[PDB]
Every structure is written in C-alpha cells, then in structure tokens.
Enzyme design. Structure first.
Site, short mmCIF file in Angstrom:
data_model
loop_
_atom_site.label_atom_id
_atom_site.label_comp_id
_atom_site.label_asym_id
_atom_site.label_seq_id
_atom_site.Cartn_x
_atom_site.Cartn_y
_atom_site.Cartn_z
N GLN A 105 0.83 -1.21 0.00
CA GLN A 105 0.00 0.00 0.00
C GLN A 105 0.87 1.26 0.00
O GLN A 105 0.54 2.24 -0.67
CB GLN A 105 -0.95 -0.01 1.19
N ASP A 108 2.46 1.66 -3.45
CA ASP A 108 1.38 2.09 -4.33
C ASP A 108 1.15 3.60 -4.20
O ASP A 108 1.01 4.31 -5.22
CB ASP A 108 0.12 1.32 -4.02
N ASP A 110 3.16 5.86 -3.10
CA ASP A 110 4.29 6.62 -3.60
C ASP A 110 4.12 6.81 -5.11
O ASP A 110 4.52 7.82 -5.65
CB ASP A 110 5.59 5.94 -3.22
N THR A 184 4.07 11.68 -7.99
CA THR A 184 5.22 11.44 -8.86
C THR A 184 5.39 9.95 -9.13
O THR A 184 5.32 9.14 -8.21
CB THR A 184 6.51 12.02 -8.28
N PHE A 186 8.10 8.45 -9.90
CA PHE A 186 9.34 7.95 -9.33
C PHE A 186 9.09 7.41 -7.92
O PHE A 186 8.24 7.92 -7.20
CB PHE A 186 10.43 9.03 -9.29
N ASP A 188 10.17 7.75 -4.74
CA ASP A 188 10.94 8.90 -4.32
C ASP A 188 10.46 9.43 -2.98
O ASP A 188 10.80 10.57 -2.65
CB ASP A 188 10.88 10.00 -5.37
N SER A 190 7.56 10.43 -2.24
CA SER A 190 6.59 11.49 -2.41
C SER A 190 5.45 11.35 -1.41
O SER A 190 4.79 12.34 -1.08
CB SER A 190 6.11 11.60 -3.82
N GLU A 258 -6.36 6.48 5.80
CA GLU A 258 -7.41 5.61 5.33
C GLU A 258 -7.53 4.37 6.24
O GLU A 258 -8.63 3.88 6.45
CB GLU A 258 -7.12 5.27 3.87
N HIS A 351 -5.47 -5.78 -2.44
CA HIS A 351 -6.79 -5.82 -1.83
C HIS A 351 -7.18 -7.23 -1.36
O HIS A 351 -7.96 -7.36 -0.41
CB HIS A 351 -7.83 -5.17 -2.75
C1 HEM Z 1 -6.91 -1.89 4.42
C2 HEM Z 1 -6.16 -1.65 3.36
C3 HEM Z 1 -6.60 -0.84 2.19
C4 HEM Z 1 -7.69 -0.02 1.99
C5 HEM Z 1 -8.71 0.37 3.05
C6 HEM Z 1 -7.68 0.42 0.62
C7 HEM Z 1 -8.62 1.28 0.02
C8 HEM Z 1 -8.56 1.79 -1.28
C9 HEM Z 1 -9.47 2.74 -1.86
C10 HEM Z 1 -10.69 3.31 -1.19
C11 HEM Z 1 -9.03 3.02 -3.11
C12 HEM Z 1 -9.67 3.98 -4.11
C13 HEM Z 1 -10.49 3.13 -5.03
C14 HEM Z 1 -11.09 3.86 -6.19
O1 HEM Z 1 -11.83 4.85 -5.97
O2 HEM Z 1 -10.95 3.41 -7.36
C15 HEM Z 1 -7.84 2.23 -3.30
C16 HEM Z 1 -7.09 2.28 -4.44
C17 HEM Z 1 -5.88 1.60 -4.58
N1 HEM Z 1 -5.32 0.71 -3.74
FE1 HEM Z 1 -6.07 0.10 -2.01
N2 HEM Z 1 -6.65 -0.17 0.00
C18 HEM Z 1 -5.97 -0.98 0.86
C19 HEM Z 1 -4.82 -1.72 0.62
C20 HEM Z 1 -4.04 -1.72 -0.52
C21 HEM Z 1 -2.93 -2.55 -0.78
C22 HEM Z 1 -2.41 -3.54 0.22
C23 HEM Z 1 -2.48 -2.24 -2.07
C24 HEM Z 1 -1.34 -2.77 -2.85
C25 HEM Z 1 -0.44 -3.65 -2.38
C26 HEM Z 1 -3.38 -1.24 -2.59
C27 HEM Z 1 -3.26 -0.62 -3.81
C28 HEM Z 1 -4.18 0.31 -4.32
C29 HEM Z 1 -3.95 1.05 -5.55
C30 HEM Z 1 -2.88 0.96 -6.57
C31 HEM Z 1 -5.02 1.82 -5.75
C32 HEM Z 1 -5.20 2.76 -6.94
C33 HEM Z 1 -4.59 4.11 -6.50
C34 HEM Z 1 -4.73 5.10 -7.63
O3 HEM Z 1 -3.92 5.05 -8.61
O4 HEM Z 1 -5.71 5.91 -7.60
N3 HEM Z 1 -4.29 -0.96 -1.63
N4 HEM Z 1 -7.59 1.45 -2.21
O1 LIG Z 2 -6.06 4.44 0.18
N1 LIG Z 2 -7.05 5.22 0.17
O2 LIG Z 2 -7.85 5.69 -0.68
CA LIG Z 3 6.48 9.08 -6.10
#
Ligand code: HEM
Ligand SMILES: O=N[O-]
Ligand SMILES: [Ca+2]
Ligand SMILES: *[C@@H]1O[C@H](CO)[C@@H](O[C@@H]2O[C@H](CO)[C@@H](O)[C@H](O)[C@H]2NC(C)=O)[C@H](O)[C@H]1NC(C)=O
Ligand SMILES: *[C@@H]1O[C@H](CO)[C@@H](O)[C@H](O)[C@H]1NC(C)=O
Ligand SMILES: *[C@@H]1O[C@H](CO)[C@@H](O)[C@H](O)[C@H]1NC(C)=O
Ligand SMILES: *[C@@H]1O[C@H](CO)[C@@H](O)[C@H](O)[C@H]1NC(C)=O
Ligand SMILES: *[O-]N=O
EC number: 1.11.1.7
Length: 595
Positions: A105, A108, A110, A184, A186, A188, A190, A258, A351
């Site tokens: 997370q 991600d 970053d 960003t 990178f 990094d 951020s 979050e 997730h």
């Molecule tokens: C309890 C743990 C976590 C919660 C409550 C959570 C919650 C969320 C929420 C609410 C979103 C926005 C979804 C949307 O509107 O499309 C999101 C996006 C995302 N989550 Fe999770 N998440 C969790 C854990 C993780 C983990 C463990 C990873 C990766 C190993 C991850 C990677 C992502 C990524 C890449 C996005 C897209 C971010 C973006 O580019 O906007 N999350 N998550």
């Molecule tokens: O990781 N929260 O949207």
């Molecule tokens: Ca970054």
C-alpha cells in the site's frame, strides 16, 4: 497524427539541470522530456483506451450498448458472485507477515493516485448522486443487482464519481479521456514529502533550520513524534468518533489515514526523516536546513527503493522477478518512467491480501489489553486508536507477528472491505472496494483481460474450457463466463487476480508481467535512482546496502525484538532477535571533507 501537447493544466518547466536533488513535482528528472514522471500529468497508456463511444463513456454506461456483443455485468454482481466469502478461517498467508500487505500500500501510494474529479465543487450534484442514484456527467453510481442484501438497508446504489482527467475537467478533451496521476511516478518518498510545492512546504519545519519535518504539537508517543494533524474540515477521522475528535494526519499523501496501519507506516517514515536530519547536523553542523532536509529526503527515498526492490518485489514476482527486473545496469534516459493506467489496477492485487482484523501486541508479543484485536472496518480513518490507545508500537508489533491474507480463488476480498468500507462524505461503513475497483477500470477505459494477455505474450482463452485451463479452476471459470460471456470482456482487475500465483510469488503470470515491466521502468528511467553512478558516493552506497525494515523499526519505536526478514511470516520469540544483532545505517560517509 494527434494533439501532441495538451498540457495546459500545470505548465511548470522551471528546470535546473545542475541540481543534485529531485524536484518535489518530479519535473526535470528526464532532461530531454522534463515532464516525464511528474505529478499532475496523464497516466501513461500502454494500450489504447477502450470506451463505449471511443472517447470517454465507460463500458456499462448505456444499457443497450454491448461490449463485443454482450452486456457488461454490474460491478456489484461480480463482487457478490465471485469476490465475496463468509469464512475467515484458513485464509491467512503462512509465509507473509502483515507488513507485506502494508508495504504494498505504501509503495502504491508513492507511485499513483487518480483522484475523483472535482466537479461536485459546490454542487448538490455530489449529494444528488448519493441521494437519487442518477447517472450523468461524472456521477457513475454502482447500482445494486436484484437480490443484493444492501438493497434492503442502503437504497438503490453505492455512489461513485469518475476520476479526474487532463485538459478540461467539466467538458471533454479530444482524443480518448486520459486520467491524471496526482503523485510522482518515481519511487521517491513522495508519500512522505508531497508531490506539490505548497504541501511539501507545509509539511516542513521551517521554524528551526534543522531541516526537519513538522510534527504533532498536541500529542507525542512516549516522547516520539506523531504526524501533524490536518486542521481542515469536514474530517473523516473526526466523523468516525465525534467524542474523541481526533483528526486525520497530514502527510505527503492525502490518503495516509485511510487505515490505522497505513498511518502507522507513515509515522515510522516521518520519524526516520527527522532522525536522519539530526544525525546529519551532528556530522555536518555547518549544513543549513535546506541541505539537511534535502540530504535526509534523499536517504529516505533510497531506503524505500532498496526495501522495495531488494525485499518486496522478489516475494511478489517470485520466479518472474529475474525475467522482468534483471540486475541494474544504470540510468537509461530512453525509458518511460511514467506509471501506466493499467498498473494502477494491477497493483490492486493488494486488496486480496488484507485480512479481517488488526491486533495490538505488547512487548511480549502478547495481546495488548482487552480489545487487542479489532475488526478492520472499525479502523478506517481511525487516528484516535493511535493517539489515545497505545501509540504505534503495539500496532508495529502486530505488523511483524500477524499474517497477510492469502489470495484465494474462493476467498478473494474480506467483507470488511467488500461490504463495510467507509469513504469520506458517505457516512456509512457500507461500501464495496471490489465493486469500486471494477467500476474504476471501466471509468479508466481499460482494455479487457485478453487484450492484456496478448500484451504480455500469454494465451487468450476464448471458451469456458480455455478459461478453465488458464485459471486452473472450473467453477471460477464458469462463474466468469456466466457473468461476462467471453473472456475478452473480463475486467482486468478480476481477470488478473483470478490467475493462480507463480512459483514463490503472490501474483499470477499476467500481473507479474504488468507489475514487473512497470517496476523495471521506474528503476531504469529514474535519473536519481540510488544506485545510479553519481547519486551517492561509493562509501555512501555501501552504507545504504545495509538498510532493513527491522532497523527502521528499531531506530524509530521502542521495540527491541524484531525479525531479520520482516516480510516473512515471523513468530515470537523464535524468529525474533534483539535489535542489537541488526545492522545500522552508518552515516559516517555523509561527513563532508570541507576542512
Ligand atoms: C486496508 C487496506 C486498504 C484499503 C482500506 C484500501 C482502500 C482503497 C481505496 C478506497 C481506493 C480507491 C479506489 C477507487 O476509488 O478506485 C484504493 C485504491 C488503490 N489501492 Fe487500495 N486499499 C488498501 C490496501 C491496498 C494494498 C495492500 C495495495 C497494494 C499492495 C493497494 C493498492 C491500491 C492502488 C494501486 C489503488 C489505486 C490508486 C490510484 O492510482 O488511484 N491498496 N484502495
Ligand atoms: O487508500 N485510500 O484511498
Ligand atoms: Ca512518487
Ligand atoms: C470514541 O473514542 C472514545 C475516547 O477515545 C472511546 O472511549 C473510551 O473507550 C475506552 C476503551 O477503548 C474506555 O476504556 C474509556 O473509558 C473511554 N473513554 C472515554 C473518553 O469515554 C469510545 O469508545 C469511542 N467510540 C466509538 C464509537 O468509537
Ligand atoms: C518462505 O518465504 C521465503 C520467500 O518467499 C522463502 O525463501 C522461504 O523458503 C519460504 N519458506 C517455505 C518453506 O515456504
Ligand atoms: C520545529 O523545531 C523546533 C526545534 O526543534 C521545535 O521546538 C518545534 O516544535 C518544531 N515545530 C514543528 C511544528 O514541528
Ligand atoms: C534504453 O531503452 C530503450 C527503449 O526501452 C532500449 O531500446 C535501449 O536499448 C536502452 N538503451 C540502453 C543503453 O540500454
Ligand atoms: O482530513 N482529510 O483526510
């Protein structure tokens, strides 16, 4: 032949090609194309966008418009039929700690953030979406299927607003819609320092010249620093407990509060910056604040890089690591370091690694108090459980001693996220992250599963029996065919996550390919990668080779027993050693020879 520079929102090109430090925005990393990897630009497209109308409308938008001849299924129906399960027994990963999930997370955050459009800026249109479940413009509600339990308690839909996109925001942009990455590309730090100047400045302690990050003035953790509070409203962290009135944290990334283990991880990271800034002053008392901030920032960024590429990625990608991320060979300024749109869905494999509970553990790695273990859903936007219920140490212990959930084709996403998710401004613990993910990859115009299989050089199943063979699961294959009617129409998030995992990793082939390529690019196309000749001295890099998540915890908590390999499943006291047997980061090589 198409518009070749629709880059009006944010036109900073204010580059110093001398500078030894990263900009905050990511600009000026690539000399030939200074905006590559910078925040507040379009996500890269690895394949062309696929919208219902060629330009912007998601598949699913218009009832009578098919995808390859078939209606796309409701996101919530896919969630209910494929993604959900009842029994949390037997679901845990016997060889991944909870830190493994949490680091995912962090990384991600970053790398990517595509926030919802701000067109519900002073419009009941944001509330009307919630209220009346009325699709239009950026309101794209997730509608409940006929037999959904939530229809009985929560109305007709879950609200959902389309992601921001470059060029205009209210009207369209010509060529396909392209969503923004607000952070960003990178790796990094951020998420600690910010991706915008104002935030980056606000986070700093410019009252002393010690190059420190601001800390909380209202509370302390047995004398250790907390993150500042975000004193703006309404505050989700206040909303979830109005008695406690404890606001969200303010970090380099908007999403830091979050869940309480994310907040925890952000807290470690801040403390490390401060600790490094204070070490460097001792070793260089002639260094001013800027120089101290920048030098500490640069070490922390390296730290995140090393942990991620040395420790994390090998146990995600397993056997595929070496294929996609060969040993480093220096900066290549021809590589695109931008995060792809698809990667922002591929990295949501995390997730399926989130378990249903969080524990607080004492200094004997025993239950901390009478409610040491709590349901995940009570911990969304929860800072008061940190401030008023033991600080981060009990939570950091649980990160070490508890396990991630294991992806399971029969048990994909815990109901704590599937059914009990809380989102700011929506008031209930009643949303579905799986459904959101599926709706989001339609929002982002994602090509379907076989398009991505093609991209990765993998077979493209066309029938049930083909799908059964690829997923090695007859029943899952069958549920997917019943809902989607062709594997060409399977949403990439669910398709990728449905594939059995590769040897020694925690994702399947398709995801290993999408993730591996992305990580290869952000390493190779980064001018300030830690191991690039020039960035650190050779003595500095020998020092940085020793970093570990174990030492990060030892240096920035009051915990004294830790595993050597913090991402493995570790049990106390067997696999826990004293902090003394753990290598430090020697900042001797940062002494200047000015005299
Ligand atoms: C309890 C743990 C976590 C919660 C409550 C959570 C919650 C969320 C929420 C609410 C979103 C926005 C979804 C949307 O509107 O499309 C999101 C996006 C995302 N989550 Fe999770 N998440 C969790 C854990 C993780 C983990 C463990 C990873 C990766 C190993 C991850 C990677 C992502 C990524 C890449 C996005 C897209 C971010 C973006 O580019 O906007 N999350 N998550
Ligand atoms: O990781 N929260 O949207
Ligand atoms: Ca970054
Ligand atoms: C909101 O937060 C308050 C205060 O932090 C919670 O109350 C405390 O709960 C602990 C157990 O965790 C008790 O031992 C204390 O006696 C309580 N103190 C106060 C200030 O009343 C309360 O449980 C929280 N409520 C919700 C719904 O989360
Ligand atoms: C546990 O995980 C690590 C990393 O994947 C691996 O080296 C180790 O051998 C694993 N143990 C077993 C027996 O699965
Ligand atoms: C900044 O540093 C000074 C000196 O250490 C400290 O007293 C002050 O509280 C800090 N300010 C913030 C808000 O972090
Ligand atoms: C850099 O990347 C490009 C495109 O990815 C590749 O063709 C080229 O061989 C690489 N250059 C070097 C010096 O390896
Ligand atoms: O206060 N915002 O998360």
């Amino acid at each position: 032949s198409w518009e070749v520079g629709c880059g009006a929102p944010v036109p900073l090109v204010k580059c110093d090609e001398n500078s030894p430090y990263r900009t905050i925005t990511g600009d000026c990393n690539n000399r030939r194309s200074p905006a590559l990897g910078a925040a507040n630009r379009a996500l890269a497209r690895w394949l062309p966008a696929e919208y219902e109308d060629g330009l912007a409308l998601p598949f699913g938008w218009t009832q009578r418009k098919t995808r390859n001849g078939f209606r796309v299924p409701l996101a919530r129906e896919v969630s209910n039929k494929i993604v959900g399960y009842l029994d949390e027994e037997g679901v845990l990963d016997q060889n991944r700690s909870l830190l493994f999930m949490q680091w995912g997370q962090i990384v991600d955050h970053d790398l990517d953030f595509a926030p919802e459009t701000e067109l519900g800026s002073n419009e009941h249109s944001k509330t009307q979406c919630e209220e009346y479940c009325i699709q239009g413009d950026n309101c794209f509600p997730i509608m409940f299927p006929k037999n959904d339990p939530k229809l009985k308690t929560q109305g007709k839909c879950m609200p959902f607003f389309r992601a921001g996109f470059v060029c205009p925001t209210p009207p369209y942009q010509s060529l396909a819609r392209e969503q923004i990455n607000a952070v960003t590309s990178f790796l990094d730090a951020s998420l600690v320092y910010g991706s915008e100047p104002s935030l980056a400045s606000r986070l700093r302690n410019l009252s002393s010249p010690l190059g420190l990050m601001a800390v909380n003035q209202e509370a302390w953790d047995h004398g250790l620093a907390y993150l500042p509070f975000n004193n703006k409203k309404p505050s989700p962290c206040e909303f979830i407990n109005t008695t406690a009135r404890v606001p969200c944290f303010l970090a380099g990334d908007f999403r830091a509060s979050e869940q309480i283990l994310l907040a925890t991880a952000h807290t470690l990271l801040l403390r490390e910056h401060n600790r490094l800034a204070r070490e460097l002053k001792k070793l260089n008392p002639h260094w001013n604040g800027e120089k101290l901030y920048q030098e500490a920032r640069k070490i922390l960024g390296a730290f995140i890089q090393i942990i991620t590429f040395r420790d994390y990625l090998p146990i995600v990608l397993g056997s595929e690591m070496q294929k996609w991320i060969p040993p480093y060979q220096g900066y290549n300024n021809s590589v695109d370091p931008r995060i792809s749109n698809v990667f922002t869905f591929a990295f949501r494999f995390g997730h399926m690694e989130v378990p249903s509970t969080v524990s607080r553990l004492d200094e004997n790695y025993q239950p901390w108090g009478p409610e040491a273990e709590l349901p995940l859903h009570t911990l969304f936007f929860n800072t008061w459980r940190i401030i008023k219920d033991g600080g981060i140490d009990p939570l950091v212990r649980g990160l070490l001693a508890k396990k991630s959930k294991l992806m399971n084709q029969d048990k994909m996403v815990t109901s704590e996220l599937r059914n009990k998710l809380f989102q700011p401004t929506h008031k209930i613990h009643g949303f579905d992250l799986a459904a959101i993910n599926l709706q989001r990859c339609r929002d982002h115009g994602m090509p379907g599963y076989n398009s991505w299989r093609g991209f990765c050089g993998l077979s493209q199943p066309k029938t049930l029996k083909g799908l059964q063979t690829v997923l090695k699961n007859k029943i899952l294959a069958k549920k997917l065919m019943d809902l989607y009617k062709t594997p060409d129409n399977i949403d990439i998030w669910i398709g990728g996550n449905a594939e059995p995992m590769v040897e020694r990793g925690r994702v399947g082939p398709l995801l290993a390919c999408l993730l591996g390529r992305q990580f290869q690019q952000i390493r190779d196309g980064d001018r300030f990668w830690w191991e690039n000749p020039g960035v650190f001295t050779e003595k500095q890099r020998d020092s940085l080779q020793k970093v570990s998540f174990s030492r990060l915890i030892c240096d920035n908590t009051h915990i004294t027993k830790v595993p050597l390999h913090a991402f493995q499943a570790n049990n106390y006291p067997h696999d826990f050693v004293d902090c003394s047997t753990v290598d430090k980061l020697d900042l001797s090589p940062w002494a200047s020879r000015e005299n």
